């Protein structure tokens, strides 16, 4: 009966650890818990505004896989098509190891490799990673200025660091995975998203860019977490300061467009994504995804020994990973409230979203923290999955 | 105390097992055993003519492997050099497994690796082999009218049957080595043998195509083994019937040249090629390999596990590898007398030599019988190594 949502919000806007918070839970697709709490930015102490715009970062891959799932769907590719039918610079990979040894690949990249990090790339954060001083020397991702197609020419000549297929690592294939989808089909991931699923959705809001009238609604991003710096060695301090993101993250690039990060949303643009995930369908009945694709999709795909799913060795227990993200397969292993089978992913903002379907619910938290030391988005969840029956 | 030597020769002429039998026991570069037994051939009984002439098949890889080691140590290469810096056909060489798996080699092959048969190469005659089909096909060993320049074009296409430096099989390693010398040299292999090793230990009658004088001195061979015929699934009969050489084994061609095999020879020119081994010299004092080189060549290289060293499976007992062939590291495990360090090898056709040095002993057995079911060189060293210290 408290509301255990608002009262977790409020403590974290109270003790100075996030600028501003919005929450909704959907249950059979109709609010059934929402709210907000905070501002805009602590600086003016501007209320959230109606309609507020967030980085969502990697909460951008669930959109982009699920696209890579429609073009299957339609016959554009395969998952075990090799990505080097379709960009033959990712034809002859290499593969670097913690002893400073290289040899070819063993097995060649294909498109479910992309879908579920198993191609041996990495990303220019991983601290401890062989190549991703590599990665930030090339500035894959701190220079967002650059093109899409041209990011991806430097990547594919660097080395992976492991056979693919062999291991797991989260990574930058989200982002092979959108360039692989403008050379299978000839056109742009962003024209793409906007019509096969943005427009359907009604998710008018986002995008790579932000709209006309969006200045005034982008929330301001605090923290101090890099994702193209040299790896943090210790958790940056959680500080409520403004983030720099260089240009990183432009928001007015009509060019800009990427898989693993970069899209712009809301937090009712997000949660039509989510209920949509529960179904495969418009709210009007419309099919985006077959359920037979859609079960695919959700299936748990890679498991884990144990130490389980890690990234940069922070635990993801009890979750398995499928073509979308995370999935829930053991509450006996789970750190927080969740039912078996529960999915979704979140952003390195502290953007997070589920969806149980043994509950038909959905719920999606906002907020703009690059670095969080405290796990909002899992809080959210359990208090919300503590407030059900 | 008895001349074991010439029991087993005679008892083996006598069974009709072999037509006839020449060999020689050195010990400090005299002869101190002698004989032959038997005819030239069964079919005119003609006695075994002055210096008679052998196919002595693999017994080629030591002098090839000799020749390499003094390229070595004039500074044409070394054990290390990559054989891809001389033919670039042997850039990006692939392995093929029992398993109808193929992928890229995670090694560069090596001179060493050559000389150790640990590059991954086979044999058209290796039974149960993932590739020797594929050897048969492109008609390597049976072509032998084929410039080794060419046929080693066509190996290069071919996949290895494990990763170099990572195993060992018996192979067409040295026919490799013979053709990289060449690249490496720019001068042909059988020119370089002529000059190094044979002119200065006056192995007059020894090369590529019979001497002027030698047709009638041609030892005729039998025996039903093919070394380029589908595998046999059990050992060839033992029938003293004149062996059908096909085109594999020219007399009189020019440019014939290999590095496993192809060689004729006589007793006498083999043992001055195995009394040299002893310290490297000329009988005169010339030094062909310097004693530290010599010692590198020698010391025992390919460690075998359990089931040791085997070839079609049959088994090499107490032997490791070296750079020139076996070498005795176990008396303890040897199937026939011998003593720690004793090294040589031996020919398809039975003929069979070895090197003691702790009794600075050479000794060779030369006859012509393919498919051999009786080991008519182990008996003869284990008859000498009775009859001495």
Redesign the interface.
Known sequence: MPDLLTNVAENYVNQDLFAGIEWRIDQDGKPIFQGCAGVKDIETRTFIPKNAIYRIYSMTKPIVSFLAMMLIERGVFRLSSPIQNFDPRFKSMKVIDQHAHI?????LITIEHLLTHQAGFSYDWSLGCPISAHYRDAQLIEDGGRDLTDMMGVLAELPLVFHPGTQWKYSISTDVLAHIIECATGERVDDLLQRLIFDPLDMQDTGFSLPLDGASRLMEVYGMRSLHGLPALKPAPHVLVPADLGSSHPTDDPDFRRGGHGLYSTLDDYMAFANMLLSGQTPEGETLLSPAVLKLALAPRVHFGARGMRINDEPFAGYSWNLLGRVMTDVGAAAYATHLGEFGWSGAAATYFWVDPTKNMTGCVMTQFLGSQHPIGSDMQAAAMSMLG
């Open positions: 040899e070819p690949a063993t097995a």
